[PDB]
């Protein structure tokens, strides 16, 4: 259901099978490279239930460039693209062994997606850095043009990340805001007291 939805939760402990299937998944995990997840916690995230045919967008840095590829493969995705965001100031100038001018987002595919608009955007984002750890808003427009009007889910998002067509999960969101009746119904069955533990 078009307007933004979100669940404040521990993504480790949420039963994501109540959310249904999504055309696009995006994750910006707190890699252990504060609230981080161990490598084993990342591997055991129930990403496989979230999609049948579609795309995963997975932000990586440092050794999560490798560990993210591992998770991507374990969850049943093939990595088919890699977006980089070149970080500029407001005058379009670029901000261990080398200084870092960019962030990486792996793009994985699962199954055989049909009816996506592949090739509309290119794999380089040039955009102004804002708050720390804040992804560029351009990615949502890219994803919308790639898969217009479909259901999407973001993992480890923050309040500024909520978007129409997206359900946002993170432990710094404000409560639970669900409007999709399919989801509302499955959430009430699974969580009749509204609590998400264990």
Partner 1 sequence: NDYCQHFVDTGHRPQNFIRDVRELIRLKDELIAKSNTPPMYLQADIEAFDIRELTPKFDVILLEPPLEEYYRKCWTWDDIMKLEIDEIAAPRSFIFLWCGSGEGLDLGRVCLRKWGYRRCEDICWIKTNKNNPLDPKAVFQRTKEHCLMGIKGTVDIDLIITEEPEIGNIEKPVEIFHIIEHFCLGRRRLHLFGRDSTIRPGWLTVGPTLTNSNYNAETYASYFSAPNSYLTGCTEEIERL
Ligand X SMILES: O=C(NC[C@]1(O)CCCN(c2cc(NCc3ccccc3)ncn2)C1)c1ccc(CN2CC3(CCCC3)C2)cc1
Which of 94, 88, 84 is closest to 129 using CA atoms? 88
Does 101 participate in binding partner 1 (rule CB under 8 A)? yes
Q: Taking a C-beta distance cutoff of 8 angstroms, is the pair 178, 7 a contact? A: yes
Q: Is 110 annotated as a binding residue?
A: no
Choose the contact partner of 17 out of ligand X, partner 1, none; CB within 5 to 8 A by kind.
Answer: none
Does 59 participate in binding ligand X (rule CB under 6 A)? yes
Which of 58, 41, 165 is closest to 106 using CA atoms? 58
* Residue 153: both structure tokens together: 């889910």
**In Å, how far are 12, 45, 74, 77, 177 from 71, measured between CA atoms?**
15, 9, 5, 9, 29
Residue with Cβ nearer ligand X (37 or 47): 37
Q: Give the total of residues touching ligand X (CB under 6 A).
A: 17
Q: Which of residues 11-30 bind partner 1 (CB under 8 A)?
A: none
Phi, psi for 127 (deg, rounded to 5) = -155, 155
Does 150 participate in binding partner 1 (rule CB under 8 A)? no
Q: Taking a C-beta distance cutoff of 8 angstroms, is the pair 71, 28 a contact? A: no
CB of 72 to ligand X, least distance (A): 16
Instruction: Report which secondary-structure segment, H or E, holds 144.
Output: helix 138-146
Choose the contact partner of 81 out of ligand X, partner 1, none; CB within 5 to 8 A by kind.
Answer: partner 1
Choose the contact partner of 35 out of partner 1, ligand X, none; CB within 5 to 8 A by kind.
Answer: ligand X
Choose the contact partner of 10 out of partner 1, ligand X, none; CB within 5 to 8 A by kind.
Answer: ligand X
Q: Using CA atoms, how far apart are residues 143 and 186, in angstroms rounded to an integer?
A: 27
Does 81 participate in binding partner 1 (rule CB under 8 A)? yes
Binding residues for ligand X, rule: CB under 6 A, are: 10-12, 28, 30, 35, 37, 59, 61, 103, 133, 135, 156, 158, 170-172
Residues in binding site for S-adenosyl-L-methionine: 10-11, 28, 135, 158-161, 171-172
């Amino acid at each position: 259901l078009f307007p933004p939805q979100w669940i404040c939760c521990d993504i480790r402990y949420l039963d994501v099978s109540i959310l249904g299937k999504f055309a696009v998944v995006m994750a910006d995990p707190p890699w252990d490279i504060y609230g981080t997840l161990t490598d084993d916690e990342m591997r055991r995230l129930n990403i496989p239930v979230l999609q049948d045919d579609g795309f995963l967008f997975l932000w990586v840095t440092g050794r999560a460039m490798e560990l993210g590829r591992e998770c991507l493969n374990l969850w049943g995705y093939e990595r088919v693209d890699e977006i980089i965001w070149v970080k500029t100031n407001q005058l379009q100038r670029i901000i261990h062994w080398l200084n870092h001018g960019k962030e990486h987002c792996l793009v994985g595919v699962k199954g055989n997606p049909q009816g996506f608009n592949q090739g509309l955007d290119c794999d380089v984002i040039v955009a102004e850095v804002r708050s720390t750890s804040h992804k560029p808003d351009e990615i949502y427009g890219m994803i919308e043009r790639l898969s217009p009007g479909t259901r999407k889910i973001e993992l480890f998002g923050r309040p500024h990340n909520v978007q129409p067509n997206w359900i946002t999960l993170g432990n710094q969101l404000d409560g639970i805001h669900l409007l999709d009746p399919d989801v509302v119904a499955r959430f009430k069955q699974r969580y009749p007291d509204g609590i998400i533990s264990k």
